[PDB]
Design a protein around this ligand. Sequence first.
Ligand code: FES
Ligand SMILES: [Fe+3]
Length: 102
Amino acid sequence: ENWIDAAARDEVPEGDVIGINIVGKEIALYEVAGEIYATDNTCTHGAARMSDGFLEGREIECPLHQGRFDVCTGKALCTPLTQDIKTYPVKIENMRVMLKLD
Ligand code: FES
Ligand SMILES: [Fe+3]
C-alpha cells in the first residue's frame, strides 16, 4: 500500500547509514542494533545530505552544522535544528528492505 522493495538488507552497513534515490525521493537507510530505519536524506535545516554522514547509535549527525536526529522517531535533538525529519516505515522481508512511502 505504497510498500516498495528498496534495497538488499546487507547493503546497509552495521552502525552506519546509506543514501538511495528511489521513485524521485532521496532516502536515508540506517542500521541500528539489528533494525533498519529510514528518513528523508535531506536535513531539515539546510542543504545537507544525511547519508554523509556519522550515525552514532540511533543518532544521525548532520555533516554541516552537527544537528542530530533520533533515527527511530525522526525527532530533532540539538540545535541548530528546529524541525523534525520525516520517517518512513520499514520491514525486512526475505533479505529485502521494504519502505512505506506515504
Ligand atoms: S544543515 Fe543540517 S544542521 Fe543546519
Ligand atoms: Fe561521540
